[PDB]
Amino acid sequence: FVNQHLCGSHLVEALYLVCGERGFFYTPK
Amino acid sequence: FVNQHLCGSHLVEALYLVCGERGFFYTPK
Amino acid sequence: FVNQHLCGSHLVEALYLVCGERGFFYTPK
Amino acid sequence: FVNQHLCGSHLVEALYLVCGERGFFYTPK
Amino acid sequence: FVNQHLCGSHLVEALYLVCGERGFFYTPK
Amino acid sequence: FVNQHLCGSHLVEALYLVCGERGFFYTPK
Amino acid sequence: GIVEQCCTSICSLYQLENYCN
Amino acid sequence: GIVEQCCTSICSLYQLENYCN
Amino acid sequence: GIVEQCCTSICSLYQLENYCN
Amino acid sequence: GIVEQCCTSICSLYQLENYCN
Amino acid sequence: GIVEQCCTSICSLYQLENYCN
Amino acid sequence: GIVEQCCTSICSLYQLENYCN
Numbered sequence: 001f002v003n004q005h006l007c008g009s010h011l012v013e014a015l016y017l018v019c020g021e022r023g024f025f026y027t028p029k
Numbered sequence: 030f031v032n033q034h035l036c037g038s039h040l041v042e043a044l045y046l047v048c049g050e051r052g053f054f055y056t057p058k
Numbered sequence: 059f060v061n062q063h064l065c066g067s068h069l070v071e072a073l074y075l076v077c078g079e080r081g082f083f084y085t086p087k
Numbered sequence: 088f089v090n091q092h093l094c095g096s097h098l099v100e101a102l103y104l105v106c107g108e109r110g111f112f113y114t115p116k
Numbered sequence: 117f118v119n120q121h122l123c124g125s126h127l128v129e130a131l132y133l134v135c136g137e138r139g140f141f142y143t144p145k
Numbered sequence: 146f147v148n149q150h151l152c153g154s155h156l157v158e159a160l161y162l163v164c165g166e167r168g169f170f171y172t173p174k
Numbered sequence: 175g176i177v178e179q180c181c182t183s184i185c186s187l188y189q190l191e192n193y194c195n
Numbered sequence: 196g197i198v199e200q201c202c203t204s205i206c207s208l209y210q211l212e213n214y215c216n
Numbered sequence: 217g218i219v220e221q222c223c224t225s226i227c228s229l230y231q232l233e234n235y236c237n
Numbered sequence: 238g239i240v241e242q243c244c245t246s247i248c249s250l251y252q253l254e255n256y257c258n
Numbered sequence: 259g260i261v262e263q264c265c266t267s268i269c270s271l272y273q274l275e276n277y278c279n
Numbered sequence: 280g281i282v283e284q285c286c287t288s289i290c291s292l293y294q295l296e297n298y299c300n
C-alpha cells in the first residue's frame with residue numbers, strides 16, 4: 001500500500017501546482 | 030505572493046497526511 | 059534500495075509533522 | 088511561527104540526505 | 117539567505133513537473 | 146513509469162541541495 | 175480559508191482536520 | 196479516480212488539470 | 217524500526233507518533 | 238535568473254517553461 | 259539548536275552534518 | 280544518465296555531485 005501512499009503525496013503536490021487559485025479536491029478511490 | 034504559494038505547498042502535504050482516506054479540499058485565497 | 063530511500067524521505071516528513079515541538083530521532087535499521 | 092515550520096520541513100529533508108545511514112536528530116526550538 | 121533557498125527548492129520541483137521530458141536547468145543567483 | 150517519475154522528483158531535490166550555488170542541468174535519459 | 179487561518183499562524187493537526195472531506 | 200489513473204500510469208500536467216476545481 | 221514497520225506497510229499518524237521524542 | 242523572476246513574484250507554469258531545456 | 263543556526267542563516271552540508279547521529 | 284544510475288541504485292551525495300554544474 002506504501003507505493004500508493006507515496007505516489008499520492010506527489011499527486012497532490014502536482015495538483016497544487018497545476019490547479020493554482022482554482023484549488024482542488026483530493027478524493028483517492 | 031510567493032510566501033503564500035510556499036505555505037500552501039506545505040499545507041497540502043499536511044492535509045494529505047492528516048486526512049488520510051477522507052481526502053481533503055484545498056481552496057486558496 | 060531506492061524504494062526504501064524514497065519511502066524514508068516521506069517518513070521523515072511525516073514525523074516532522076506529527077512530532078511537532080517534541081522533535082524526533084530518525085534511526086533507519 | 089509559520090516561517091520556522093516551513094524552514095524545518097526543508098531542514099529535515101536535508102538532514103535525511105546528508106546524514107544517510109547515520110540518521111539524524113531533529114529538535115526544534 | 118534562507119528564504120531564497122526555500123523558494124528554490126519549490127521552483128525545482130515545479131520545473132521538474134512543468135518541463136517533463138525536456139528536463140530543465142536550474143541556476144541560482 | 147510512475148516509479149521513475151517519483152524517483153526523479155527526489156533526485157532533483159537532492160541535486161538542488163548538493164549543487165548549491167553551482168546549479169545543475171536535469172536531463173533524464 | 176485555510177491560508178488565512180494556517181499561513182498567518184501555525185495550525186495543529188486537529189485544526190487541519192477541519193479541511194478534511 | 197486519480198490514484199487509479201495516475202499511479203498506474205504517468206499523467207501529464209494536462210491530465211492532472213481534470214481533477215482541478 | 218520505522219523503515220521495517222512503515223515502508224512495508226502504511227503507518228497512520230498514530231503509529232508514526234511512537235517514533236517521536 | 239529564475240530566482241529574481243520567480244521568488245520575488247509568482248510565476249505561471251507558462252513563465253516557468255522558459256527554464257525548460 | 260539547528261533552527262537558530264540554520265533558519266536564520268543558510269547552513270552548508272558540512273554544518274548540517276553536526277546534527278547527524 | 281542520472282535516472283539510469285541513481286533510480287536503479289542509491290547514489291550518495293558524492294555520486295550526485297557529478298551531475299552538478
Ligand SMILES: Cc1cccc(O)c1
Binds near residue numbers: 201202
Ligand atoms: C505529477 C505526477 C505525480 C504523480 C504521478 C503522476 O502520474 C503525475
Ligand SMILES: Cc1cccc(O)c1
Binds near residue numbers: 069222223225227
Ligand atoms: C506518512 C507515511 C510516510 C511513509 C510511509 C508511511 O507508512 C507513512
Ligand SMILES: Cc1cccc(O)c1
Binds near residue numbers: 286291
Ligand atoms: C538523493 C537521492 C534521491 C533519489 C535517488 C537516489 O539514488 C538518491
Ligand SMILES: [Cl-]
Binds near residue numbers: 007064065151152
Ligand atoms: Cl516516492
Ligand SMILES: [Cl-]
Binds near residue numbers: 035
Ligand atoms: Cl517553504
Ligand SMILES: [Zn+2]
Binds near residue numbers: 006010068
Ligand atoms: Zn516520493
Ligand SMILES: [Zn+2]
Binds near residue numbers: 039097
Ligand atoms: Zn517549502
